Write a protein that binds this DNA or RNA. Structure first.
Lengths: 59, 62
DNA sequence: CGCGCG
DNA sequence: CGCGCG
């Protein structure tokens, strides 16, 4: 479905960008593209950051 | 001339040079983006040709 | 190496 | 907004 729901499913299943990226490919693109979506949701209040590497979780 | 030669020439003409300073000098003396300049500046930093002196940081010969 | 950057 | 990154 939409990238936000696929990322939400990855977190439900603190998850990193690499974890989220691997969940989407193995269940359903490049590091830059996924990062843009992750930071767009962070700007909108859907996600929260917890570093190096970037760990993501649902707000 | 090579990027190292253009960058050095930009640094000497400064009256301590910023990336935009080096970029503007090159673009009006030879008319040759941000990633390509920073690639060379930070490479010449690694080889000891240049030194940093902040945000975005100023460049100078070593 | 965190990088998403326009 | 520092970004050079591969």
């Amino acid at each position: 479905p939409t990238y936000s729901e696929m990322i939400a499913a990855a977190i439900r299943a603190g998850s990193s960008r690499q974890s989220i990226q691997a969940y989407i490919k193995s269940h359903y693109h490049n590091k830059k593209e996924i990062n843009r979506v992750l930071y767009s949701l962070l700007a909108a209040g859907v996600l929260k950051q917890t570093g190096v590497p970037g760990s993501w979780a649902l707000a």
